[PDB]
A paper describes a structure:
Antigen presentation by major histocompatibility class I (MHC I) molecules is central to adaptive immunity. MHC I molecules bind peptides and present them at the cell surface to specific receptors on CD8+ T cells. MHC I molecules bind peptides in a groove that is lined with discrete pockets (A to F). The stability of MHC class I molecules is highly dependent on interaction with a bound peptide ligand.
The 8mer FAKKKYCL and FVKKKYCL control peptides were also synthesized. Comparisons of FA and FV 20mers with their corresponding FA (pink) and FV (green) 8mers show that 8mer peptides adopt nearly identical bound conformations and that P1 is the most divergent position in both 20/8mer pairs, with shifts in Cα-atom of 3.13-Å for FAs and 1.42-Å for FVs. MHC I peptide ligands are usually 8 to 10 amino acids long and bind with their N-terminal amino group pointing down in the A pocket, as seen in the FA and FV 8mer structures. Interestingly, the structure of FA 8mer shows that the P1 side-chain phenyl ring occupies a canonical position and forms hydrophobic interactions with Tyr59, and that residues Gln54 to Tyr59 are visible. Similar observations were made relative to the FV 8mer structure. In contrast, the canonical structures of FA and FV 8mers showed very similar networks of interactions and exhibited identical Tm values, 71.1 °C for FA 8mer and 71.4 °C for FV 8mer. Finally, it is worth noting that there are two water molecules in pocket A of the 8mer structures. These water molecules form a network of hydrogen bonds with MHC I residues in pocket A, including Tyr59, that anchor the peptide N-terminal amino group. Results show that FA and FV 8mers have symmetric distributions centered around 90°, indicating that the two aromatic rings are essentially perpendicular to each other.
Residue numbers in the entry:
A (entry chain B): 0 to 99
B (entry chain C): 1 to 8
C (entry chain A): 1 to 275
The structure:
Amino acid sequence: MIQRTPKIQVYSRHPAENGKSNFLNCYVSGFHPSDIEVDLLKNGERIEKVEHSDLSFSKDWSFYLLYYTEFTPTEKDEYACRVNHVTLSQPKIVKWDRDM
Amino acid sequence: FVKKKYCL
Amino acid sequence: GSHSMRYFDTAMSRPGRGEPRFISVGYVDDTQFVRFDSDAASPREEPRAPWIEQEGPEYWDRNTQIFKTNTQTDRCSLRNLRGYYNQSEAGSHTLQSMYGCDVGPDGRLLRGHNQYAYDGKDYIALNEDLRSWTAADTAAQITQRKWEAARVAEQDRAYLEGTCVEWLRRYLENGKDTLERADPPKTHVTHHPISDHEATLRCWALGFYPAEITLTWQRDGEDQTQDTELVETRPAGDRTFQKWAAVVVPSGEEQRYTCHVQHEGLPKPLTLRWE
């Protein structure tokens, strides 16, 4: 059995403007096998009713998924994506940074 | 349009 | 432009948790137009693109029937693959499939595809001739012999040169306002100091479709492949994609760097600098 660890990116659909509604994205790609757990976090707490895309993969056979939810960025609030996968000894947290 | 598949 | 139709299928066994899940997703380029998931509770509510609805209920019924039979076929495949590798009934295993056709701007067939991977490793592929197979190992040789005996490649060839090309052309016509529209990237360069000595220049491309794009940094007109951080192209959720490329540059040398962008929706390639 070969395993590939996920690449994780956290970012907004549109350029972020404090006080304006947007979508928060966590894109996980490059992983194998397909089982994976992804949460989006607001100030460290799990956001409910997050949706995701349908399981698909790249031509190198590595899987990808987009998890997403509506959000209104502010100065105060912190957002992140938490991912778990068989390749990870502990969940991996990636913070949202509007410059990436 | 989907393709009929064959068992490996 | 040229276009592709591709189905990406994943079958995954899960001993003790029911039968293997089968999911098939169909795309035209980077637009998903159909899903069939054996775990969906309401197959009728399963997403289809709008230019698929216009094809009517008999079209949907014929596709649904083949997807249902494909679920059973991929479960047969997973049972056989477990045996070909002497594997226990305890573990989860994965069979992936990609199949479909690529056409040029006139709609003519460029090439067909029908290939498989097991547990993330290539297993068997229909060759570009649409007549012969490439098998990765002695297990895939068993599949190859069975498919040769049953003349399976001739059935696949007929789908790839016939049904696949014909329906891709129909989808492109019905969806021409979206599927045949390339949206160019919106581009800018940002600057992020890292110390008194260096800063990152990041070249952004936002809002583009399809996903294929080339983004590169040059220093004095020389490509900086080894020193450029290039993130994977990523979906925005509005059909479009995003990508960035970054280099670390010495303070004061920023104007020696140029970012270069190629994309189908641009009338001409872009050259951009900081400020």
